[PDB]
Design an enzyme around this catalytic site. Structure first.
Site, PDB file in Angstrom:
ATOM      1  N   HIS A  45       0.857  -1.166   0.000  1.00 16.02           N
ATOM      2  CA  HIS A  45       0.000   0.000   0.000  1.00 16.02           C
ATOM      3  C   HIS A  45       0.898   1.223   0.000  1.00 16.02           C
ATOM      4  CE1 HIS A  45      -1.752   3.293   2.504  1.00 16.02           C
ATOM      5  NE2 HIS A  45      -2.658   3.207   1.546  1.00 16.02           N
ATOM      6  N   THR A  46       2.037   1.107   0.669  1.00 14.13           N
ATOM      7  CA  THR A  46       3.004   2.192   0.738  1.00 14.13           C
ATOM      8  C   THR A  46       3.383   2.707  -0.661  1.00 14.13           C
ATOM      9  OG1 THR A  46       3.944   1.581   2.892  1.00 14.13           O
ATOM     10  CG2 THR A  46       5.407   2.711   1.338  1.00 14.13           C
ATOM     11  N   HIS A  66      10.042  -1.549  -2.048  1.00 18.21           N
ATOM     12  CA  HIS A  66      10.855  -1.780  -0.864  1.00 18.21           C
ATOM     13  C   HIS A  66      10.850  -3.222  -0.339  1.00 18.21           C
ATOM     14  CE1 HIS A  66       6.802  -0.771   0.289  1.00 18.21           C
ATOM     15  NE2 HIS A  66       6.985  -1.148   1.537  1.00 18.21           N
ATOM     16  N   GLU A  67       9.895  -4.036  -0.784  1.00 21.05           N
ATOM     17  CA  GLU A  67       9.830  -5.439  -0.358  1.00 21.05           C
ATOM     18  C   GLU A  67      10.570  -6.245  -1.413  1.00 21.05           C
ATOM     19  OE1 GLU A  67       6.097  -6.985   1.509  1.00 21.05           O
ATOM     20  OE2 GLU A  67       5.120  -5.201   0.717  1.00 21.05           O
ATOM     21  N   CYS A  96      22.770   1.490  11.338  1.00 21.72           N
ATOM     22  CA  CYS A  96      24.155   1.940  11.293  1.00 21.72           C
ATOM     23  C   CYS A  96      24.934   1.344  12.444  1.00 21.72           C
ATOM     24  CB  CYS A  96      24.224   3.456  11.382  1.00 21.72           C
ATOM     25  SG  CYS A  96      24.128   4.053  13.093  1.00 21.72           S
ATOM     26  N   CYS A  99      24.742   5.166  16.003  1.00 23.71           N
ATOM     27  CA  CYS A  99      24.092   6.460  16.204  1.00 23.71           C
ATOM     28  C   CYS A  99      23.380   6.504  17.552  1.00 23.71           C
ATOM     29  CB  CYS A  99      23.098   6.753  15.075  1.00 23.71           C
ATOM     30  SG  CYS A  99      21.609   5.699  15.084  1.00 23.71           S
ATOM     31  N   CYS A 102      20.572   3.874  17.289  1.00 20.38           N
ATOM     32  CA  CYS A 102      21.018   2.507  17.119  1.00 20.38           C
ATOM     33  C   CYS A 102      21.628   1.926  18.399  1.00 20.38           C
ATOM     34  CB  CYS A 102      21.977   2.406  15.927  1.00 20.38           C
ATOM     35  SG  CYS A 102      21.138   2.444  14.297  1.00 20.38           S
ATOM     36  N   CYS A 110      17.109   4.177  13.115  1.00 20.78           N
ATOM     37  CA  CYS A 110      18.422   4.731  12.774  1.00 20.78           C
ATOM     38  C   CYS A 110      18.291   6.022  11.963  1.00 20.78           C
ATOM     39  CB  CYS A 110      19.281   3.724  12.010  1.00 20.78           C
ATOM     40  SG  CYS A 110      20.914   4.370  11.494  1.00 20.78           S
ATOM     41  N   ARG A 368      -0.664  -9.737  -0.567  1.00 19.51           N
ATOM     42  CA  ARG A 368       0.702  -9.443  -1.007  1.00 19.51           C
ATOM     43  C   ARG A 368       0.923 -10.036  -2.390  1.00 19.51           C
ATOM     44  NH1 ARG A 368       0.914  -6.822   2.803  1.00 19.51           N
ATOM     45  NH2 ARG A 368       2.510  -5.234   3.243  1.00 19.51           N
TER      46      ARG A 368
HETATM   47  N1  LIG Z   1       3.876   1.696  10.899  1.00 20.51           N
HETATM   48  C1  LIG Z   1       4.607   1.000  10.039  1.00 20.51           C
HETATM   49  O1  LIG Z   1       5.835   0.831  10.207  1.00 20.51           O
HETATM   50  C2  LIG Z   1       4.006   0.366   8.990  1.00 20.51           C
HETATM   51  C3  LIG Z   1       4.678  -0.545   8.257  1.00 20.51           C
HETATM   52  C4  LIG Z   1       4.097  -1.156   7.230  1.00 20.51           C
HETATM   53  C5  LIG Z   1       2.775  -0.830   6.927  1.00 20.51           C
HETATM   54  N2  LIG Z   1       2.112   0.050   7.627  1.00 20.51           N
HETATM   55  C6  LIG Z   1       0.738   0.560   7.391  1.00 20.51           C
HETATM   56  O2  LIG Z   1      -0.157  -0.303   8.036  1.00 20.51           O
HETATM   57  C7  LIG Z   1      -1.429  -0.207   7.421  1.00 20.51           C
HETATM   58  C8  LIG Z   1      -1.823  -1.586   6.860  1.00 20.51           C
HETATM   59  O3  LIG Z   1      -1.351  -1.900   5.501  1.00 20.51           O
HETATM   60  P1  LIG Z   1      -1.638  -3.312   4.847  1.00 20.51           P
HETATM   61  O4  LIG Z   1      -0.309  -3.599   4.155  1.00 20.51           O
HETATM   62  O5  LIG Z   1      -1.816  -4.288   5.951  1.00 20.51           O
HETATM   63  O6  LIG Z   1      -2.704  -3.566   3.832  1.00 20.51           O
HETATM   64  P2  LIG Z   1      -4.169  -3.210   3.516  1.00 20.51           P
HETATM   65  O7  LIG Z   1      -4.348  -1.919   2.815  1.00 20.51           O
HETATM   66  O8  LIG Z   1      -4.488  -4.257   2.535  1.00 20.51           O
HETATM   67  O9  LIG Z   1      -5.166  -3.450   4.771  1.00 20.51           O
HETATM   68  C9  LIG Z   1      -6.351  -2.754   4.658  1.00 20.51           C
HETATM   69  C10 LIG Z   1      -7.360  -3.482   5.542  1.00 20.51           C
HETATM   70  O10 LIG Z   1      -8.020  -2.520   6.449  1.00 20.51           O
HETATM   71  C11 LIG Z   1      -9.403  -2.709   6.265  1.00 20.51           C
HETATM   72  N3  LIG Z   1     -10.232  -1.578   6.662  1.00 20.51           N
HETATM   73  C12 LIG Z   1     -10.476  -0.406   5.965  1.00 20.51           C
HETATM   74  N4  LIG Z   1     -11.351   0.415   6.683  1.00 20.51           N
HETATM   75  C13 LIG Z   1     -11.643  -0.300   7.829  1.00 20.51           C
HETATM   76  C14 LIG Z   1     -12.447   0.047   8.890  1.00 20.51           C
HETATM   77  N5  LIG Z   1     -13.050   1.238   8.925  1.00 20.51           N
HETATM   78  N6  LIG Z   1     -12.590  -0.842   9.964  1.00 20.51           N
HETATM   79  C15 LIG Z   1     -11.916  -2.079   9.963  1.00 20.51           C
HETATM   80  N7  LIG Z   1     -11.095  -2.415   8.885  1.00 20.51           N
HETATM   81  C16 LIG Z   1     -10.985  -1.499   7.837  1.00 20.51           C
HETATM   82  C17 LIG Z   1      -9.547  -2.967   4.721  1.00 20.51           C
HETATM   83  O11 LIG Z   1     -10.840  -3.524   4.431  1.00 20.51           O
HETATM   84  C18 LIG Z   1      -8.479  -4.080   4.659  1.00 20.51           C
HETATM   85  O12 LIG Z   1      -8.990  -5.258   5.275  1.00 20.51           O
HETATM   86  C19 LIG Z   1      -1.203   0.834   6.269  1.00 20.51           C
HETATM   87  O13 LIG Z   1      -1.438   2.164   6.744  1.00 20.51           O
HETATM   88  C20 LIG Z   1       0.260   0.700   5.930  1.00 20.51           C
HETATM   89  O14 LIG Z   1       0.703   1.950   5.389  1.00 20.51           O
HETATM   90  C21 LIG Z   1       2.733   0.635   8.652  1.00 20.51           C
HETATM   91 ZN   LIG Z   2       5.579  -2.617   1.871  1.00 21.46          ZN
HETATM   92 ZN   LIG Z   3      21.984   4.122  13.455  1.00 22.16          ZN
END
Ligand SMILES: NC(=O)c1ccc[n+]([C@@H]2O[C@H](COP(=O)([O-])OP(=O)(O)OC[C@H]3O[C@@H](n4cnc5c(N)ncnc54)[C@H](O)[C@@H]3O)[C@@H](O)[C@H]2O)c1
Ligand SMILES: [Zn+2]
Ligand SMILES: [Zn+2]
Ligand SMILES: NC(=O)c1ccc[n+]([C@@H]2O[C@H](COP(=O)([O-])OP(=O)(O)OC[C@H]3O[C@@H](n4cnc5c(N)ncnc54)[C@H](O)[C@@H]3O)[C@@H](O)[C@H]2O)c1
Ligand SMILES: [Zn+2]
Ligand SMILES: [Zn+2]
Lengths: 373, 373
Positions: A45-46, A66-67, A96, A99, A102, A110, A368
């Protein structure tokens, strides 16, 4: 290395426009960098966000992604941890290892490369991606949507060579994040009730996490009902749909546990569901984790009484894992059958049809999409 | 006991009206209760709230007050931990010691009496305070503004008899709360930077707490400059005034620590200063504690990125202490000179002039007005 590899890649020239496959000139490793031969990359999604153009800080043209997972094509001056032929996984959060962040065991953020990575350039303020004369900016330090990429010395996690490259690459994002969200951040305790808001990829890794952690009643929550089957398959003892009731979702969860859930993770990225998740936690000790990124400007909120009555509000990045040290271990966890990974790849594609991946995403069909390069 | 004690008390007949000293009939202990002879009681912002009439749930007429200390006049049927002559301190958060919350080490919120206490009645839905025929409701299970009060079996903390009764009573509120806020909740670590928003009573106990905890740079913050001297006296290495700058207070604190404070406590009860406190914490590990109660309906808020970048948002009640077990120990901490207490009493009054206490409060002159009964 010295030679300039010319190869295939999926450049994104202008926001809102479909990724155009292209030939590009990937320059050779400058000191403390490594050129990686991609062998598989997935779509998140990112990546969609940047391409969407809504990313306030999304400079173009950029080779997103990124994956990824691949083999080291060659290393640059001053590198020693890697060598041409080593099986690796690039990472968007480096380690790193010296830092301010880290050296401290309370975080994995990091900062050593933060500003340079942000400007889509290498640690020396330049890019390695040339194309028809134009300069293509790197993305998240990885730039996996390319047959060959160039990442910094510290963004690589060397892994098990017999690791199914077309699968382990999902550890560079979603999976890890959600696993750690339950294992690291929340440090969940055996026997605890939980609730997971959002049953997409990240959400599933949390359900997985809660299980290996030894939970006792994981409750999945999603709007789209189709997500329910795999949720329950992954460990969820029950699944409910917000839309299925007239009471606020928090009020529903509470009645179901006579008090509230002990832990609660919001994996959607929807501020309204975030305060909803928190308020569903149990009085006096309930904990809430924010794993989902949100839109610029959207802000969470609630009545402080929630925190005064004993509720902790937490958030997490890459599930807490100190990248370089952890990724390698997660792969072992995979190989030794402790954790699931294949179960996340719902679709395989070929490089040429890369754009199709962004297509199935927009339909809630994927968990995925993996693409063979 | 059997006899009905008739004595002096400060009844509050109607909200917004000054406490009228009155003669009242304090009934004798029913099973599992104890009648306490007050010897000293102080005045808190809390008491002001109810009297103010703004307390949405403030039934009248009520004999307010909760910071008291006294001798047990007599016990009721089925009591054994206490006896006529024991030096005690009533508490507004009991410790039944067998409920869902009392058995768990993550919280101090005993629910066994929650609903009955709320309706200003004893555990059997009746009051012990009669007056000119009318029924006066108890307040916070204590009702210290009376020569004699009746509290339940579980709201009493027996203490050191040689304890200066006209001082130890400040342990039934402000002091404990703030001490625990730094010691229990935040579990602050030696060498850490801190910031305290609000330099009134509670705030001072936190500065104290951070010190015994072994902090390394406690920063007091208050609008009223007069609070600064005692702050610095208590342990604060520096004191700043929000009003003294043009940048937002969070932006000021950050620049002062090149990143942010490690911990941060908001002791005012001002939602705008609450998100301000949180956003002043350090990236990746900063923790924020809400110790101050707020107005009904006021709600905190911030961008989730704060929590995602690694910030925990916490809150606290009575500083975490499991009442009955802790209070007694805090007194020892006092006697053995480990913690300060007298330093909080800025004014002494006589019962008759009780109303004067609420008066100095409204002027930011007091830290804790103690009243001899
Ligand atoms: N914080 C981080 O480090 C980090 C890392 C990776 C991903 N993420 C984020 O985490 C989130 C999840 O991404 P994803 O890869 O799992 O895929 P995703 O977009 O496929 O998951 C979406 C899910 O949320 C559901 N949803 C939407 N509205 C809803 C609601 N109102 N109530 C309940 N469920 C609802 C959708 O139907 C779907 O099931 C995204 O914001 C992504 O950017 C964060
Ligand atoms: Zn990703
Ligand atoms: Zn570092
Ligand atoms: N959570 C609990 O269990 C618990 C327990 C006891 C007390 N409290 C609450 O804690 C809070 C503190 O009460 P108190 O007894 O310490 O006394 P208090 O009323 O005397 O403290 C007020 C202090 O806050 C300062 N202040 C006001 N606006 C400010 C601002 N914008 N920025 C910085 N400082 C500001 C005032 O100038 C004063 O210094 C209250 O809300 C009280 O109800 C909470
Ligand atoms: Zn008080
Ligand atoms: Zn209890």
């Amino acid at each position: 290395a010295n030679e300039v590899i010319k190869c295939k890649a999926a450049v994104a020239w202008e926001a809102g426009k479909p990724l155009s496959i292209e030939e590009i000139e990937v320059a050779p490793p400058k000191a403390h960098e490594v050129r990686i031969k991609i062998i598989a990359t997935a779509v998140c999604h990112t990546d969609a966000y940047t391409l969407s153009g809504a990313d306030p800080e999304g400079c173009f043209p950029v080779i997103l992604g990124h994956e990824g997972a691949g083999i080291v094509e060659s290393v640059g001056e001053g590198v020693t941890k890697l060598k041409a032929g080593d099986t690796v996984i690039p990472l968007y959060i480096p380690q790193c290892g010296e830092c301010k962040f880290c050296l401290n065991p309370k975080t994995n953020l990091c900062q050593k490369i933060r500003v340079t990575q942000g400007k889509g350039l290498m640690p020396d303020g330049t890019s390695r991606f040339t194309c028809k004369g134009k300069t293509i900016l790197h993305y998240m330090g990885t730039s996996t949507f390319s047959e060959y990429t160039v990442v910094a010395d510290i963004s690589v996690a060397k892994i098990d060579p017999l690791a199914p490259l077309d699968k382990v690459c999902l550890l560079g994002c979603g999976i890890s994040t959600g696993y750690g969200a339950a294992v690291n951040t929340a440090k969940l305790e055996p026997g605890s009730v939980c609730a997971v808001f959002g049953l997409g990829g990240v959400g599933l890794a949390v359900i997985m996490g809660c299980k290996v952690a030894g939970a006792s009643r994981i409750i999945g929550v999603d709007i789209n009902k189709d997500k329910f089957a795999r949720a329950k398959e992954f460990g969820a003892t029950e699944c409910i749909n917000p839309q299925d009731f007239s009471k606020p979702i928090q009020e529903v969860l509470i009645e179901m546990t006579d008090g509230g859930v002990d832990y609660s993770f919001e994996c959607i990225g929807n501020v309204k569901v975030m305060r909803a998740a928190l308020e569903a936690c149990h009085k006096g000790w309930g904990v809430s984790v924010v794993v989902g990124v949100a839109a610029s400007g959207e802000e969470i909120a609630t009545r402080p009484f929630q925190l005064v009555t004993g509720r902790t509000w937490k958030g997490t990045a890459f599930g807490g894992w100190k990248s370089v040290e952890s990724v390698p271990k997660l792969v072992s966890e995979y190989m030794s059958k402790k954790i699931k990974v294949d179960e996340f790849v719902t679709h395989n594609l070929s490089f040429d049809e890369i754009n199709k991946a962004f297509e199935l995403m927009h339909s809630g069909k994927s968990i995925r999409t993996v693409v063979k390069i």
